[PDB]
Design an enzyme around this catalytic site. Structure first.
Site: not given
Ligand code: CA
Ligand code: NA
Ligand code: NA
Length: 443
Positions: A11, A197
């Site tokens: 991420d 997300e």
């Molecule tokens: Ca991020």
């Protein structure tokens, strides 16, 4: 020849400062690079030894206690006007949106970051941050922040993962906290535990739109993770995809969880799992590429997609990847088919374009299928033949205008480097109105 040095940061959230690029991801992991090709791993896990936040388990004690976790999820670090670095940190129990998000501040990008406090929670049993009982079908999981300035210098934060969807908050540019009285902020999309997300917003001055990047599907090797994009004239929406679908409409069906089918039709799909490898020839290949950030170089007008990815045959192993982005004639970005190696858009000649190509079609689904190649041929007479039929032409210096099976695509022709075969390749990368991306790599 191009050199790469790999790092693992799940991420990754990109930030340029002091002439150097950093990514900050989940698990308080981080890496740096001067050229986006050779990365140095700096940190990899949450422990009292991690120099970004010394004695982290004491420093962020309240967050670990609320979230009932021993780790942190996807950070963002952003420099504010005082010159300091603000890390938006968050933890989540993992099986439910029992989460807290807070901010910590450092004088120096590599730390130490000092906690200023928690400012959002999710997963409480009672009253939520917006004054109504917490309800994950409509309220966010307070994770995956991206804190950013818009074109006028106003500070915002977009965030969210699964649960109630993706939200945006006006931020205080002096303290780093949200302005008071907004609850979870304004909803941009989502609902009913959709698999969406990792929001990220990047402005493009040339097209005059904000681009909201998102990740659809599950992160793991069988999850169908893929990177998508939508755009708006304003940082806080409303956002639409290339067909003009309003992103606000996207959600799972009431009473369900992880309804992929209802959300698939929405958003431009930039990249999903694929391989250029065949029985006879090696090639590049990703599984579940996603949770991206993006960078715009004001000096050159160039844009870059930064993300993590898994790989065919490597299970859950992941590394950071960077692909250049190009705006097409309709103001939508296409990704280079190969990772960044110092290539730039240049003049392309017809002679370089004609020939046989391996073709990847990313489609519009959420799917764990690794997409494979078929072979086509761009002919000198402007037809395309072989395993698909259509036409091609070039606009100006390097713009690709391609028809395949009666759909019309636009993007770029681009010579670049294939790091697996260690050869130059001519490529094209194009996008249609349905938001389907197509890549060609010449044989
Ligand atoms: Ca991020
Ligand atoms: Na630990
Ligand atoms: Na940032």
């Amino acid at each position: 020849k191009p050199i790469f040095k790999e790092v693992s940061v799940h991420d990754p959230s990109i930030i340029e400062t002091n002439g150097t690029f950093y990514v900050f991801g989940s698990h308080l992991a981080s890496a740096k690079s001067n050229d986006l090709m050779q990365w140095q791993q700096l940190t990899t896990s949450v422990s009292n030894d991690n120099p970004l936040i010394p004695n982290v388990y004491e420093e962020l004690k309240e967050t670990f206690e609320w979230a009932q976790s021993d780790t942190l999820w996807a950070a963002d670090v952003t420099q504010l006007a005082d010159g300091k670095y603000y890390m938006y940190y968050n933890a989540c129990r993992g099986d439910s949106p029992r989460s807290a998000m807070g901010v910590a501040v450092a004088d120096n990008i590599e730390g130490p970051y000092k906690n200023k406090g928690i400012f959002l929670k999710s997963g409480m049993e009672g009253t939520s941050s917006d004054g109504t009982p917490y309800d994950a079908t409509k309220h966010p999981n307070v994770v995956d922040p991206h804190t950013f300035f818009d074109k006028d210098g106003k500070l915002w934060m977009v965030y969210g993962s699964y649960s109630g969807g993706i939200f945006i908050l006006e931020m205080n540019p002096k303290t780093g906290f949200p302005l008071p009285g907004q609850g979870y902020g304004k909803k941009l999309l989502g609902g009913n535990h959709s698999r969406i997300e990792g929001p990220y917003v990047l402005y493009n001055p040339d097209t005059q739109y904000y681009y909201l990047y998102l990740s659809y599907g599950g992160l793991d090797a069988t999850g169908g993770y893929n990177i998508r994009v939508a755009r708006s004239k304003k940082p806080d929406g409303p956002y639409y995809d290339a067909e003009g679908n309003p992103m606000l409409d996207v959600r799972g069906k009431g009473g369900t969880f992880f309804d992929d089918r209802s959300i698939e039709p929405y958003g431009v799909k930039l990249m999903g799992s694929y391989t250029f490898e065949t029985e006879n020839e090696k090639g590049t290949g990703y599984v579940s590429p996603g949770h991206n950030s993006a960078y715009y170089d004001e000096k050159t007008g160039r844009s870059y997609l930064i993300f993590h990815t898994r790989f065919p045959g490597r299970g859950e192993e992941h590394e950071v990847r960077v692909h250049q982005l190009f705006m097409n004639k309709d103001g939508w970005p296409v990704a280079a088919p190969y990772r960044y190696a110092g290539e730039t858009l240049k003049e392309v000649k017809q002679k370089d374009i004609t020939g046989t190509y391996k073709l990847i079609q990313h489609g519009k689904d959420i799917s764990a299928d690794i997409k494979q190649t078929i072979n086509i041929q761009l002919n000198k007479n402007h037809t395309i033949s072989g395993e698909m039929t259509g036409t091609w032409r070039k606009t100006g210096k390097n713009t690709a205008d391609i028809t395949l099976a009666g759909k019309k695509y636009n993007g770029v022709f681009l010579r670049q480097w294939d790091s697996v075969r260690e050869k130059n390749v001519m490529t094209f990368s194009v996008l249609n109105t349905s938001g389907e991306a197509v890549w060609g790599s010449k044989a």
